[PDB]
């Protein structure tokens, strides 16, 4: 296997972050048919994260930031959620030439939100190739954290944290920032919770008011969410729109299919058990950022700017473990939940009793970042700029 520039011509932009480019399958080799492409762009392990990681040798020893994500996927996340819902991608082989292609390929076609990005890194010389998760409804839910800490470093000035979630106390630092056009009333403590009424409630919310965490694709293509923190509350327009796109795959009447789409979204979420796994790495955030922010200071080697005596008594060995700990704890608060469904005709699964419908489905988490050492200072800052605001609002 090598890509190269006539196998371009096979492959259409389908998105982006930061850092990659998504395209996908739009040939017909039985090799990628349903797949898609992650390609690296240009930009412009530390020590101490080698030193934090220093557990899993591959890891630290991963030549590029492309292998480094794969084998965290791979060797860290993967033994803590299990391989069924989470793809690691396979590695290929990829020509300059392709890439170069690919390169002119994405500047015509990526949209106007995207015009200025960064080119494709053409001195690379691998992708990766992962399955389609979209290909269909597909149903991609950014769920952040379930749990209230509980934490004995928590202070008596943070207190409403022991009660409110994150979420919600950082809707009101949106809305002051003009970020989002109002609270939603989404909750994920209600997604979180393992109460059948309480998902639905939850699911009911997310489509509601989407902002960054509720999109629904048809065969890939949005019909719902999508970019915009920053859009608003699903109007009557974009509700009868959504209502019609689902005309065929839910087999209700006019007006009724969107209620019966919600009740299968929860059912499924439910039904897999998806969410309870995710929120056991979350919770490897065992101290709470006031407290793990102490342990960081001590593997950096520099006098602590927060000072908490006892953490700072601990051997070396157990400070990176609970900051690893946390590390890998945000990757499973920041990741996303994709479910993807098709419909049954009469000749994993969910039914639907006033349709008699039955709907295959899958589920996976993606956006499975590393989180970088240094990004303690920001979680920590984050933090105590959320409850001082909520605290200053209250
Ligand atoms: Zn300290």
């Known amino acids: 296997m090598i890509l190269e520039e006539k196998d371009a011509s096979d492959w259409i932009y389908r998105g982006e972050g930061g850092a990659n480019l998504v395209l996908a399958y739009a040939g017909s080799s039985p090799l990628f048919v349903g797949k898609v492409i992650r390609i690296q762009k240009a930009r412009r392990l530390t020590s101490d994260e080698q030193h934090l990681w220093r557990e899993?040798?591959?890891?630290?020893?991963?030549?590029?930031?492309?292998?480094?994500?794969?084998?965290?996927?791979?060797?860290?996340?993967?033994?803590?959620?299990?391989p069924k819902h989470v793809d690691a991608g396979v590695r290929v082989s990829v020509s300059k030439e392709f890439l170069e292609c690919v390169d002119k390929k994405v500047t015509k076609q990526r949209p106007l939100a995207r015009v200025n990005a960064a080119n494709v890194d053409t001195s690379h010389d691998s992708a990766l190739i992962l399955n389609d998760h979209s290909l269909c409804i597909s149903v991609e839910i950014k769920p952040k954290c379930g749990f209230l800490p509980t934490s004995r470093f928590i202070?008596?000035?943070?207190?409403?944290?022991?009660?409110?979630?994150?979420?919600?106390?950082?809707?009101?630092?949106?809305?002051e920032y003009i970020e989002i056009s109002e609270e939603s009333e989404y909750d994920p403590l209600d997604l979180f919770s393992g109460s059948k009424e309480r998902v639905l409630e939850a699911i009911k919310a997310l489509y509601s008011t989407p902002q960054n965490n509720?999109?629904?694709?048809?065969?890939?293509?949005?019909?719902?969410?999508?970019?915009?923190?920053?859009?608003?509350?699903?109007?009557?327009?974009?509700?009868?729109?959504?209502?019609?796109?689902?005309?065929?795959?839910?087999?209700?009447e006019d007006g009724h299919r969107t209620e019966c789409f919600?009740?299968?979204?929860?059912?499924?979420?439910?039904?897999?058990?998806?969410?309870?796994?995710?929120?056991?790495?979350?919770?490897?955030?065992?101290?709470?950022?006031?407290?793990?922010?102490?342990?960081?200071?001590?593997?950096?080697?520099?006098?602590?700017?927060?000072?908490?005596?006892?953490?700072?008594?601990?051997?070396?060995?157990?400070?990176?473990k609970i900051v690893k700990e946390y590390l890998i704890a945000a990757t499973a608060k920041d990741c996303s939940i994709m479910i993807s469904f098709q419909s049954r005709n009469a000749w994993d699964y969910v039914s639907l009793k006033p349709t008699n419908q039955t709907f295959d489905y899958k589920v996976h988490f993606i956006d499975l970042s590393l989180k970088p050492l240094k990004r303690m200072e920001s979680y920590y800052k984050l933090d105590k700029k959320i409850i001082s605001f909520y605290n200053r609002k209250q």
């Open 155 to 175: 202070g008596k000035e943070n207190m409403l944290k022991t009660s409110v979630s994150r979420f919600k106390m950082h809707q009101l630092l949106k809305l």
């Open 56 to 82: 899993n040798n591959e890891l630290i020893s991963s030549p590029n930031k492309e292998v480094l994500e794969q084998r965290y996927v791979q060797n860290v996340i993967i033994p803590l959620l299990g």
């Open 214 to 252: 509720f999109r629904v694709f048809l065969n890939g293509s949005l019909i719902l969410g999508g970019s915009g923190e920053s859009t608003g509350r699903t109007s009557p327009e974009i509700g009868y729109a959504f209502e019609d796109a689902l005309k065929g795959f839910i087999q209700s």
């Open 262 to 320: 919600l009740q299968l979204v929860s059912d499924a979420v439910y039904g897999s058990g998806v969410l309870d796994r995710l929120l056991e790495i979350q919770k490897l955030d065992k101290l709470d950022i006031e407290g793990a922010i102490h342990c960081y200071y001590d593997i950096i080697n520099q006098p602590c700017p927060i000072c908490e005596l006892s953490l700072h008594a601990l051997p070396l060995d157990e400070s990176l």
